[PDB]
Amino acid sequence: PTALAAAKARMRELAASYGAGLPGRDTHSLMHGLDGITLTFMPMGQRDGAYDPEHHVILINSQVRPERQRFTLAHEISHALLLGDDDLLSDLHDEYEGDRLEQVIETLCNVGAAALLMPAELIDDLLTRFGPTGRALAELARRADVSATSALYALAERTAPPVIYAVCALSLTVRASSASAGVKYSLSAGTPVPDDHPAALALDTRLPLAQDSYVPFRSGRRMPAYVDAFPERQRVLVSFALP
Numbered sequence: 001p002t003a004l005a006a007a008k009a010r011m012r013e014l015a016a017s018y019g020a021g022l023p024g025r026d027t028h029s030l031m032h033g034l035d036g037i038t039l040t041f042m043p044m045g046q047r048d049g050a051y052d053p054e055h056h057v058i059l060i061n062s063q064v065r066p067e068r069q070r071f072t073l074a075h076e077i078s079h080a081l082l083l084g085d086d087d088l089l090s091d092l093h094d095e096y097e098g099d100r101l102e103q104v105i106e107t108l109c110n111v112g113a114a115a116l117l118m119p120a121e122l123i124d125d126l127l128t129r130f131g132p133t134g135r136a137l138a139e140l141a142r143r144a145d146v147s148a149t150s151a152l153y154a155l156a157e158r159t160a161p162p163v164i165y166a167v168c169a170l171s172l173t174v175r176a177s178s179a180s181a182g183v184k185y186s187l188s189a190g191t192p193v194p195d196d197h198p199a200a201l202a203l204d205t206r207l208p209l210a211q212d213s214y215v216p217f218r219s220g221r222r223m224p225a226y227v228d229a230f231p232e233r234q235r236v237l238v239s240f241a242l243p
């Protein structure tokens with residue numbers, strides 16, 4: 001189809017290679033796959049991590065918390081992977097150039113990290129066991145050890161039916177949100193969340209609930225849907241399933 005869309009597709013595959021040659025996807029595993037490359041953690045200020053290709057060396061900020069350290073790595077690997085490919089890296093200078101080309105890149109490294117941390121197979125494995133549910137999300141994130149928001153988007157891209165996924169924290173407030181396939185009813189951040197809503201009941205009752213209800217659209221209009229909430233340390237993850 002479009003360039004980016006096919007470009008995205010490729011950058012997905014490359015991950016699939018790199019890490020198909022791996023024993024899982026914990027941090028240290030992703031490091032051992034580094035085919036003769038210098039990998040160093042130090043303090044880099046506000047810099048998360050940079051990849052110097054001529055010294056074949058990755059740098060990750062030792063200061064930042066672990067999760068992003070892990071993410072940064074996947075992202076900067078994807079940096080690595082890319083430049084490793086000419087047929088792709090070429091296609092890019094064919095429909096893009098300038099800062100454009102830069103902004104595009106980093107979005108792919110992002111797309112990269114995505115896949116490289118959360119395999120297309122760990123997701124379907126979960127969707128299969130728990131369905132498209134707040135629960136599923138809660139696991140993938142745990143199991144993958146990634147950010148509530150990272151899963152959110154991953155989980156959705158690989159979902160058949162109309163369904164919305166949403167993270168929630170107390171002020172409630174939607175924090176992030178994503179919708180599968182061809183659902184064009186969107187749910188913003190900031191969107192407040194009523195105390196009567198099943199999602200809430202589940203937080204100060206740290207109790208996994210599952211029942212019908214609606215999408216608490218901030219435009220007031222209650223759209224009906226099946227909801228499955230899974231609460232945890234300060235947040236509840238939530239799957240609205242549109243009929």
Ligand SMILES: [Zn+2]
Pocket residue numbers: 075076079106109
């Ligand atoms: Zn980058």
